[PDB]
Enzyme design. Structure first.
Site, mmCIF file in Angstrom:
data_model
loop_
_atom_site.group_PDB
_atom_site.id
_atom_site.type_symbol
_atom_site.label_atom_id
_atom_site.label_comp_id
_atom_site.label_asym_id
_atom_site.label_seq_id
_atom_site.Cartn_x
_atom_site.Cartn_y
_atom_site.Cartn_z
ATOM 1 N N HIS A 1 -3.822 0.457 -3.034
ATOM 2 C CA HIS A 1 -2.522 -0.230 -3.327
ATOM 3 C C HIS A 1 -2.078 0.703 -4.103
ATOM 4 O O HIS A 1 -1.983 1.799 -5.584
ATOM 5 C CB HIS A 1 -3.354 -0.873 -4.737
ATOM 6 C CG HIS A 1 -3.745 -2.636 -4.049
ATOM 7 N ND1 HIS A 1 -3.653 -3.196 -5.415
ATOM 8 C CD2 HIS A 1 -4.184 -2.719 -2.934
ATOM 9 C CE1 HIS A 1 -4.305 -4.649 -4.409
ATOM 10 N NE2 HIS A 1 -4.445 -4.014 -3.185
ATOM 11 N N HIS B 1 0.869 -1.497 0.447
ATOM 12 C CA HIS B 1 -0.043 -0.485 -0.012
ATOM 13 C C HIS B 1 1.083 1.172 -0.071
ATOM 14 O O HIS B 1 2.315 1.287 0.665
ATOM 15 C CB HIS B 1 -1.117 0.067 1.080
ATOM 16 C CG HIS B 1 -1.864 -1.085 0.788
ATOM 17 N ND1 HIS B 1 -3.658 -0.844 1.652
ATOM 18 C CD2 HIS B 1 -1.902 -2.330 0.821
ATOM 19 C CE1 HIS B 1 -3.647 -1.898 1.496
ATOM 20 N NE2 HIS B 1 -2.779 -2.948 0.452
ATOM 21 N N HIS C 1 -5.609 -3.089 -11.073
ATOM 22 C CA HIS C 1 -5.044 -4.361 -10.576
ATOM 23 C C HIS C 1 -4.741 -5.511 -11.165
ATOM 24 O O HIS C 1 -5.423 -6.053 -11.744
ATOM 25 C CB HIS C 1 -5.328 -4.502 -9.193
ATOM 26 C CG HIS C 1 -5.751 -5.136 -7.898
ATOM 27 N ND1 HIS C 1 -3.649 -5.319 -7.271
ATOM 28 C CD2 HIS C 1 -6.089 -6.004 -7.388
ATOM 29 C CE1 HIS C 1 -3.758 -6.248 -7.127
ATOM 30 N NE2 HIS C 1 -4.359 -7.465 -7.263
HETATM 31 CU CU LIG Z 1 -3.365 -5.062 0.184
HETATM 32 ZN ZN LIG Z 2 -3.303 -4.091 -7.118
#
Ligand SMILES: [Cu+]
Ligand SMILES: [Zn+2]
Length: 153
Positions: A63, A48, A71
């Site tokens: 993220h 993070h 992602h």
């Molecule tokens: Cu995470």
């Molecule tokens: Zn990610």
């Protein structure tokens, strides 16, 4: 660095000592660790943003996404900088991590020293859920434990 650690801890007794070794400016890092206090099954694991308490738990920003991709996991086309997909916890609630990556640096531009390594309740969906949340997080749900990546001492 050639010796970094991230001590995961949550609201409950969920805790995990992560270890990272790079040494090389632009070499393959080794990342590994061992939680103790998850439930069994797959748990999303990511770097993070930074040690940003306001993001929810003790620290867990979004993220981290320096290249601004969607992602996924290490084997996906779309993977953020710290998309280490998910790990697997035992019947005793221990997830022994052991992987390696070459995107980050631990000591360089992508110094992960200072970042916020967080585990998720559910499996990372490899950002394929066809929905923002998923395609941003892996739909991995709330963060059982959170932590910061620092020098091993
Ligand atoms: Cu995470
Ligand atoms: Zn990610």
């Amino acid at each position: 660095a050639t010796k970094a650690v991230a001590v995961l801890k949550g609201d409950g007794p969920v805790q995990g000592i992560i270890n990272f070794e790079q040494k090389e400016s632009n070499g393959p890092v080794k990342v590994w660790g061992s939680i103790k206090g998850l439930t069994e099954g797959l748990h999303g694991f990511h770097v993070h943003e930074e040690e940003d308490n306001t993001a929810g738990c003790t620290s867990a920003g979004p993220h981290f996404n320096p290249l601004s991709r969607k992602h996924g996991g290490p084997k996906d086309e779309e993977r953020h900088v710290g998309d280490l997909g998910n790990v697997t916890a035992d019947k005793d609630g221990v997830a022994d991590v052991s992987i390696e990556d070459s995107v980050i640096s631990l000591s360089g531009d992508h110094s992960i020293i200072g970042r916020t390594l967080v585990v998720h309740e559910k499996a990372d969906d490899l950002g394929k859920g066809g929905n923002e949340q998923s395609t941003k997080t892996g739909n991995a749900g709330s963060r059982l434990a959170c932590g910061v990546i620092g020098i091993a001492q």
